[PDB]
Amino acid sequence: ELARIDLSRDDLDKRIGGGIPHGSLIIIEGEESTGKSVLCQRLAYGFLQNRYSVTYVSTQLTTLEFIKQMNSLNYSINKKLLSGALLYIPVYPLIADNKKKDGFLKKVMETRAFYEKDVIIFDSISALIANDASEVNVDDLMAFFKRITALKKIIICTVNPKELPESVLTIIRTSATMLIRTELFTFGGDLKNLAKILKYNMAPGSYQKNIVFRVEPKIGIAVEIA
Amino acid sequence: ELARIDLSRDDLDKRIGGGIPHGSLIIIEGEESTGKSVLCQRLAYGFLQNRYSVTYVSTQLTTLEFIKQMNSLNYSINKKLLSGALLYIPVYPLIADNKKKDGFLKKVMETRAFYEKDVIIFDSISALIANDASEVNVDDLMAFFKRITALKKIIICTVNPKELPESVLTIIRTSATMLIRTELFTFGGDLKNLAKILKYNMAPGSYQKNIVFRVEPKIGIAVEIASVA
Amino acid sequence: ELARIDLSRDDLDKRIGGGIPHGSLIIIEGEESTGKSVLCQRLAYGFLQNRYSVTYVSTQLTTLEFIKQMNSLNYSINKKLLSGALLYIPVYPLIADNKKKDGFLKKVMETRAFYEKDVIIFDSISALIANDASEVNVDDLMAFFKRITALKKIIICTVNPKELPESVLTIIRTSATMLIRTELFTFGGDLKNLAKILKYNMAPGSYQKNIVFRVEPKIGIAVEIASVA
């Protein structure tokens, strides 16, 4: 029941208790620049290196910009793209500041291709909900995700709280099997990221509640010790 | 007791129930062009990426042709060749002349080097039998393979049934721990491969009986997803 | 329990019983040119490929020379260096001047960066002790290593017995959880390394006591057959 994300360069696998449980819905919630995307990227790279397939749906980067970003963190994924191991889905209308309102959530729920992979990542699910133009609500979306995670797949969304009402956020949080909140904070001269695991159903072992890190060129996530 | 063949790009590991059991003798039987070789190639690449060693004995491709063929599927194995992780054995006399005759089976049974690896592939064992010139028979060869798989090694052979009488094929099939039959078929005017698992002793878990695939440039085996989530 | 060192190209993992136990202190003791370094290099490459992190502290090679040496063995570690997965520490004063003297052992015990990794390699610990100018003695160093291995880390040191008195060597040996002695010997006019496992606490399974190898271009450690299947 544990999906592995192990890399030589960090011990994030130990701090989440060994791996990510199959059937997890992970919500990563935090404001801009608090490290949500990089976290998704580290997790995606971990999975892909451990022979899992990943769908990565980005409301922010074209395929090109993603390849550069991953390459910049030394999480390069060119071979994985070529084989289809990594299915990257740029949401052009949200990338392009035309930003048009659309049945995003219907598309998300109805595109079979995404869910053939082991792991499906929506960075940002908050932008997709906030720009949806339909009677599909969040309870429906959450129910749908629960159905997919019941197949032992893993879903990971980022949420920026500043672009959704509290009413909606509270529902996403309840649905989460794993809820992580990201922030920035400063100690000594240093800005750092903190990822706090507010909730972790099926927690596969003892895990660290507060994970401090920084994002480093040509490393990615550098986790700070203890 | 399970040898892993996992790759990111497909879920073939799930469909064979998790992996290939140690001590397996896998027979892949089908006519020309039904995908036997590509299947051996996918398995070999999986084993190698999961830190197993492989010997691949080919009656069809020189080393050069093999490297290209592996590269064409994006199963490139250059580094594995250089380290000796992959030992590739072209059978030149059959490659140079389809019907050249010789003590192929004696060579197969006697070359130590092949059996130092975890997995040994003969593509085609049917060509090596059909062109053997000796008193070594199939029962002897099978008994020898059984002796090697008893050491926890894995052996994989392809068989073209056009090359051997039914009397012989029946023996091989009996000896197989895993028997897979390949064919081509067309649905929606598209041509596809089917690998059907007719027998699977020591099946390590629930597995798919019919595995449909197509061979795709720079992917290799694209396995058709049978269920829609 | 078991740290994996598996590579497709050899079966070292089977000969050490499956892997290296977490919390091991491995001492590799032998004279110059008996293969201690190459063995550390094989182990380091094994760990790195199996998703552990490694610190490699060398009294002999600059970073550049290490990259060339690794590349020469087909154990190339360029990407692991760039990510910090591999932290390589050249001890410049010993590299630049064979017998320069200093508080080496203070620097070793104090530098927290080294011990953030899963596996820490000192090649050579005997040079660092022999040229230390401090109070610090071997029992202290051993006690410090024991504390770190109690955190499930693995520590690996090479020892040239020509550099230290027998009094200090006997302490390191009794303190080792895994003790391996290396020598050269010649068979068929060919010179080979032998690594003998004199002691193996927490041995995770059946293991081979004698491991013969030669160092081969683009292979590294080429382990010889124990047994012919």
Curated annotation (Swiss-Prot), chains B, C:
Keywords, A to Z?
Answer: Archaeal flagellum, ATP-binding, Magnesium, Metal-binding, Nucleotide-binding
Source species, domain of life: Archaea
PANTHER family from the UniProt entry: FLAGELLA-RELATED PROTEIN H-RELATED (PTHR43637:SF3), UPF0273 PROTEIN TM_0370 (PTHR43637)
List, alphabetically, the GO terms of the cellular component aspect: archaeal-type flagellum
**Presence of the UniProt keyword Magnesium in the record:** yes
Lineage, broadest ranks? Archaea, Methanobacteriati, Methanobacteriota, Methanomada group, Methanococci
Which parts of the sequence bind ATP?
T34, K36, S37, V38, Q60, K192
Q: What does this protein do?
A: Component of the archaellum.
Chain sites annotated for binding Mg(2+): S37
SMART domains named among the record's database cross-references:
AAA
Predominant location of this chain?
A: other
**Record's InterPro entries?**
AAA+_ATPase, ArlH, KaiC-like_dom, P-loop_NTPase
Which family is this protein grouped under?
Answer: Belongs to the FlaH family.
The encoding gene: flaH
User: Where does this one sit in the cell?
Assistant: Archaeal flagellum
Q: Care to name a GO molecular-function term for this sequence?
A: ATP binding
Which Gene3D superfamilies does the entry link to?
A: P-loop containing nucleotide triphosphate hydrolases
Give the signal sequence positions. Answer: none
Q: What is this protein called?
A: Archaeal flagellar ATP-binding protein FlaH
Organism whose genome encodes this protein: Methanocaldococcus jannaschii (strain ATCC 43067 / DSM 2661 / JAL-1 / JCM 10045 / NBRC 100440)
Q: Name one Pfam family in it.
A: ATPase
